[PDB]
Amino acid sequence: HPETLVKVKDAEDQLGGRVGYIELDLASGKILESFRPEERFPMMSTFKVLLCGAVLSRVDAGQEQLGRRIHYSQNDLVEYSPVTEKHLTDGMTVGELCSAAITMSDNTAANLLLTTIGGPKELTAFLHNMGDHVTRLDSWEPELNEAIPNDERDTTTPVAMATTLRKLLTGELLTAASRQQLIDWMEADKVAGPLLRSALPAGWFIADKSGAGERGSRGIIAALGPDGKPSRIVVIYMTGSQATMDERNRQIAEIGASLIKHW
Numbered sequence: 306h307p308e309t310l311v312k313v314k315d316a317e318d319q320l321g322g323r324v325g326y327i328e329l330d331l332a333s334g335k336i337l338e339s340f341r342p343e344e345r346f347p348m349m350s351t352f353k354v355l356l357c358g359a360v361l362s363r364v365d366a367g368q369e370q371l372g373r374r375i376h377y378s379q380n381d382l383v384e385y386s387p388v389t390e391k392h393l394t395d396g397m398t399v400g401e402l403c404s405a406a407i408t409m410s411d412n413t414a415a416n417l418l419l420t421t422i423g424g425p426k427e428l429t430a431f432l433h434n435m436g437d438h439v440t441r442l443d444s445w446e447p448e449l450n451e452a453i454p455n456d457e458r459d460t461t462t463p464v465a466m467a468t469t470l471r472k473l474l475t476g477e478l479l480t481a482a483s484r485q486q487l488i489d490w491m492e493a494d495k496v497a498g499p500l501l502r503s504a505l506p507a508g509w510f511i512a513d514k515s516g517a518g519e520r521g522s523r524g525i526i527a528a529l530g531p532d533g534k535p536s537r538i539v540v541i542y543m544t545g546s547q548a549t550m551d552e553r554n555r556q557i558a559e560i561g562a563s564l565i566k567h568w
């Protein structure tokens with residue numbers, strides 16, 4: 306039952322392309338283990354957590370309200386909008402849109418939220434303005450989903466993403482209420498069952514967000530730990546192969562099993 310780094314390397318052997326991995330201690334931020342920590346990978350829908358971090362930062366600044374209701378039209382709807390397509394008459398609140406973006410990966414929700422802050426370059430500026438000079442969003446949905454890398458638009462690195470996620474979930478960049486709101490949305494993720502959650506023992510906490518894309522791309526960002534309390538950040542990305550979805554999923558689940566068994 307392989308050690309985590311051994312399993313990550315084996316996943317890469319099996320899949321082709323690259324697999325990147327990092328594990329951070331949540332309390333201290335120290336890197337516990339890594340593979341390809343500074344190499345770029347497509348974020349895919351993992352960006353939607355960062356987007357809601359930016360929205361919450363605006364809430365904390367008095368520039369946005371989670372209860373603000375956004376109406377939109379049929380023409381706004383893009384691929385993979387399972388929540389927003391149901392609310393053409395009533396619209397959705399900003400907070401509902403973040404729940405849809407994170408928990409269901411809803412693409413129209415993400416686009417609507419990106420509009421509230423001025424687009425992908427403004428999300429990049431938010432990241433830069435928190436000290437992440439690596440991660441960048443360039444595209445809207447579903448173009449992000451539809452894209453082949455190209456290989457620097459819409460990328461992060463395992464360490465930049467992990468670092469950034471820790472800064473959103475801990476410390477004081479966001480208020481206590483906003484850090485808790487963000488982790489709640491991630492805890493409520495509905496579409497990442499095949500990944501880390503498949504390996505998760507009973508009684509553990511997990512808050513996560515997955516992604517998938519063309520050229521064998523798959524990823525997950527998570528805060529997890531035993532006894533109902535997160536205590537580590539894990540980030541896993543893969544890209545650059547011909548792997549099927551079932552194959553990508555199985556490898557992420559097996560990395561997950563190794564990290565749990567060696568915790």
Ligand SMILES: [Ca+2]
Nearest residue numbers: 314317318323
């Ligand atoms: Ca290799």
